[PDB]
């Protein structure tokens, strides 16, 4: 669904960093590797916890009962 | 929580597989330290559990239809005749409150019949306790004389991981959880991780699962640099190995080559003798939670034990 | 002191001794005949 | 060790898989003479007969693989036990050592020819173990 | 004062009285390695050790076997008070070089 | 012969980098048994605050209560402790609760549509579609409400995403924070990683001068290993640097020529905060912790 | 038709019976051989009835007091005159004023030979029959020690049981029965029970023996290169052997001089499993001598080693490692050999001892593999 | 504040006895029960 | 074939003494093998 | 056959506690 809060694995929060991860891959056009370092991940473990999230709620919220079309 | 594998074939995604998540990458070490992981059953951590790792919900729906051509019973609550504190699980209309917490015995609808004359209830029944997810009212088969007779209630039963719930990897080693044990009892590596799900040992020589061994030091790898690995099979050669290939990857980003890792005890808090094998695994929680006999009469006529026959 | 003490089911024991062991086997249609 | 497994599984992970035998013979062959399409007709061949030169480290080539797959697939008392205790339920040891049915009808004139009780009869020839453990046993 | 923390095993107690396993509740290696570990510095401990019956119950338990002119409760009161005065020597040095920084 | 005193002569700390977050120590001459005491009760013993009993009166959304009051728990709030006392469990929820043992933290979010030419942005096309962790007012009652004027209750991090909305939908909840510790639940922890490693050990046998130290110099991390000149030896510069990936062990030239082992009585300890306490504070109570064990158990009647 | 009814009446109702429970098992190595992890769901519900009387009104009266719902409670009473009395309603107030009138004399003549009847739940002195289906032989239902676990949800078994059940922690169900009379408890003790079952009646072979971690553990633990200082050495001997929980037989820790003197003091790993068989076999009899043989042979440990021939001396392990060979399911091993010379009751002391020391070793002494293999 | 709403065109429109269970706005015959303001007490774990 | 040997049995107008194990289960008898191959009496003082 | 290609720019990303990537 969406970004969890703290990395599963140590507990570095990472649920502020998926908005700003996704405008250092478009606007500044960076790797994947880069961006996450720039975020502040170093451990594989909070480095996999963004890279690999897949944010199903943006396709989720394309249901919505309270508004018509 | 929905995964993405580190680990997998390309063809995971030639079938859009990631709009139906079936896991969750986890920190697996291969290790003997708890003693209550043997063959067939595997630790999870408890912190991971208190974190939501793999947690599920399980949705059940039923229909409650009053047909059993005279229109009888009705939805709702009849005058005059009301047995106490019905009104705290059930609307106005007879129908419950969606996010209603319901227990065995609880009543889950409302109707009066005339032919008793009497307000009665359909009751809620099952070891588990649920909340009402979704209600809807269906008065279909009818031009013009409509009225509502057919009702449709889902129940979200919560599940976290139980004490007995299997648990496996995709090379088919499946295991009862064991005991979910707690952080500071599990054993921490030099990283600072402690494995959200332990697998024995003693395990691999019997399914010779190595699948899973190279698994564990892709997924690390993976993990580390952040980039996806194709794990397609005979994509390697006997020239060209991945325990190499991903060992190479390893050294380069800072671990040890052969997938292990310095552990450190959670008891003494010594480190451990020699190198644990950890690594990032995608695991998959699987969906599953008196007569005496002829048999039975004979092991008893066996111990020559008449009192426990009688 | 080695000696047997008579009350043992030496009959089922034997239908056991015989029964338990042919599961893991010429074999059962010779010792059927 | 003996904690598992045996030379045998470690020699085809380091070694090789050896020859592929199914029920008892080689690999099947089909009416053309041929064990696989890849396979020439009446192939003179260890490989086109099933056997693997490659090993589980190294990998396995794709006839080997099939041929895996035929042997590996190929691996994939109640009632006799029941007629016999219905009939010697009742059978057991009388109190004159005798072995007896449920009626009284002698069965065996005695249980062997010594009344020697089976979970007994160990040591009762390790006559040095006994020797060594004279005042212990005494 | 509350006597469920801390009690005397007398199934194990010398009868006079060197040896004693006392057992503790809600302690574990944390107290235990470190308690067992000051008590083995007297020159009257004969032998100690520290043992958890099982993870799931609370207890600690700590066998005290020493020479003659010394009891075991004597021998674990030493330990503890020990263990205090080690504390406060950890405290002092770390506020000092706090200040020295 | 061991003394306290003798201990006072011979311990050392030795602080490399002191941030606001985190802080990289080291402990030298002490044994692993306080050395692991520490980092234990930095992880466990260590409490703090946060959300505990959620309250809810709406919840439109597609994120379950459940799930929604969990997140609530998880987000670390801007709380310093002791100012708050312990929450008391035996008696009722109307005495339960009070100015000195419970902060209340309210959630009140209604979405609706705006007009804007359409991908389209939804900050843009909704109002209030997304509610972040900065959306939660803190609410002071009772007798103290002026105790928190100087100090209001935010969240360590205010862009934690909350729950994502579309027009129609509602959250309206009361949430109370309540004292709790780590090893009860996760959403108490202090700090993120409390951890020591021991100071790698370079015993280096041979001289192994010339191109031989040049390929010696790579198998450890830049400043780790330092060559004087081609002769004068080989010599370890920085062995605090090393990694201990054993990577010299796996060369013939060198398997027998060097050993890697470690210095038993140096511990280089590691410790990140989560946000509410500093990371020698939370050091610090961690010896105040275990010198309190040690004192409760000394001022105590052995029973039986 | 009535022979239709019949066909069978005799096969399939000639029977369920009450009183009884079941539950998935799991392994416990923290519990005896001859015991049985009991959740406390199945303990504050399989009462008994324990008829009151002079030697037990106190534990029944507490019991009494407690009522159904604390444990040790009770759920029912019942009187001389035959009636019950349910204590399930009832308030502390009542429960108390019950218990004060357990031990009243009967004034009628026709039930003066009757004394009331208190239906406890379970303690920790009960036998319960452990049953693993099928049951193919008796082995399969034993008699099991009830240990109360508390916040337990499954039933705890120990690996030396998994044998004779034929039973894998691989999500199995065991029934539990909890037989209700003295005669009934006296058979589940002394002839199903679990003890006198060392050594099997098909081939008179043991049955019973530690299988993985501490056979691996017992070749490192006993290897030549194996040393121990006096505080590790102290350390495993209690670690396994707790004389208040009556594992010794001299009331306190014997333990043997150091194997090196000088410079430092250093006792062998062999030397802890001469102190574990000092410390649980009597003192009035003589050490074992026993000349076996390993599995692993003298050229795996070097050159001129005589490791392979397994040596007892006056109960001394002086020569030779311990594989599966010795302290496995293994007829003519150190076990069997212990179980001859002292009896069953003493190798399943070494069995449990043995157990607890190789996995408290692990603990400090962790094994893995890799592909370099 | 009584609520249903069409499981169609999303309308919240809620119905009295003798009605016919269908959408005032649209030609649907299924409804969904909607919620109201209450109170759910929740553990943050 | 139950009602076939009753028919012999009837017809033989037999005794069934109740000695065989299924005999003893079937008119609720202590089975006859092991502890039901004795019979166990209390020895009383008085005359 | 032909063999697969290696990858490109591969430095390291792990030092020591107090270390940061200042080292070239
Ligand atoms: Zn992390």
Redesign the interface.
Known sequence: ??????C??????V??K?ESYLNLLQEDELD??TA??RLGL????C??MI??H?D??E???RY?????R | ????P?VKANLYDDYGM??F?NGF?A?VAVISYTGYDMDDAMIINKS?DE???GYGTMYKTEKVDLALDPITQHFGFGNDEWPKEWLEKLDEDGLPYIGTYVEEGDPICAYFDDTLNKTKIKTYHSSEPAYIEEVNLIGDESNKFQELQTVSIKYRIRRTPQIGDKFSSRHGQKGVCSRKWPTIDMPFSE????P?IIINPHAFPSRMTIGMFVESLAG?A??????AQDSTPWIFNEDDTPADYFGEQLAK?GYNYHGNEPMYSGATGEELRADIYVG?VYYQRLRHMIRVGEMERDALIGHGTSFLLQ | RSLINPGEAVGIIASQSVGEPSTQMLGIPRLRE | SGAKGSNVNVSQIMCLLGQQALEGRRVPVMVSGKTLPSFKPYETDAMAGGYVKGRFYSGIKPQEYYFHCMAGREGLSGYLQRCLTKQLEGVHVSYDNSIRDADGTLVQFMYGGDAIDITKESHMTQFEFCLDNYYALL | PDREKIKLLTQATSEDGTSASFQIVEEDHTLGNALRYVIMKNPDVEFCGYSIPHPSENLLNIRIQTYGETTAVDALQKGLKDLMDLCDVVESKFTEKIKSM | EWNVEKFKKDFEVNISSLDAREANFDLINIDTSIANAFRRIMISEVPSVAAEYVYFFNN?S??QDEVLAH?IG???LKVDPDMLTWVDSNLPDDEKFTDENTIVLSLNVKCT?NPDAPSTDPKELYNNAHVYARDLKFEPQGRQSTTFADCPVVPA?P???LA?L????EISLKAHCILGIGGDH?KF?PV??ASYRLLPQINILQPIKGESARRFQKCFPPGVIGIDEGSDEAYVKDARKDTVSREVLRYEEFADKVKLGRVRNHFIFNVES?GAMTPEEIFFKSVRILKNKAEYLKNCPITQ | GVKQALEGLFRKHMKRVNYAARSVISPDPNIETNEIGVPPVFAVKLTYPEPVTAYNIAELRQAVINGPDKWPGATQIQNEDGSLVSLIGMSVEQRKALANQLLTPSSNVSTHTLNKKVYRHIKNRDVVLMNRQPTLHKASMMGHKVRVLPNEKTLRLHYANTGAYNADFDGDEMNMHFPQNENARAEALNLANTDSQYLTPTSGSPVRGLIQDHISAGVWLTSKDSFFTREQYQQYIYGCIRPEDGHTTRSKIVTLPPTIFKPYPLWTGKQIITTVLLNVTPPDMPGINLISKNKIKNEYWGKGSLENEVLFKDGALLCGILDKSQYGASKYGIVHSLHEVYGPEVAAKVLSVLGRLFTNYITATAFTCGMDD | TLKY?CAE??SKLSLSRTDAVRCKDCGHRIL?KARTKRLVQFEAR | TTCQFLTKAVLDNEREQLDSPSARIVVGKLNNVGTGSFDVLAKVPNA | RKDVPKVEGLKL??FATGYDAEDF
């Open positions: 669904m969406i970004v969890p809060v703290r599963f694995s140590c507990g570095k929060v649920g502020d998926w994947e590797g996450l370092s170093k451990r594989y473990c480095r996999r890279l690999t897949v199903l709620i396709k989720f919220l919505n009962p309270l508004e018509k | 929580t929905g995964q993405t580190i990631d709009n998540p990458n920190v991971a974190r939501g790792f990283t600072g991780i402690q959200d690390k993976g993990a580390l640099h952040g980039i980003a990032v | 439109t597609v994120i997140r998880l987000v670390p549509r991090d862009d934690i995403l994502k579309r027009p129609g939908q996760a922890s993120s990683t989560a | 709403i065109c999303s969904l | 990303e792990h």
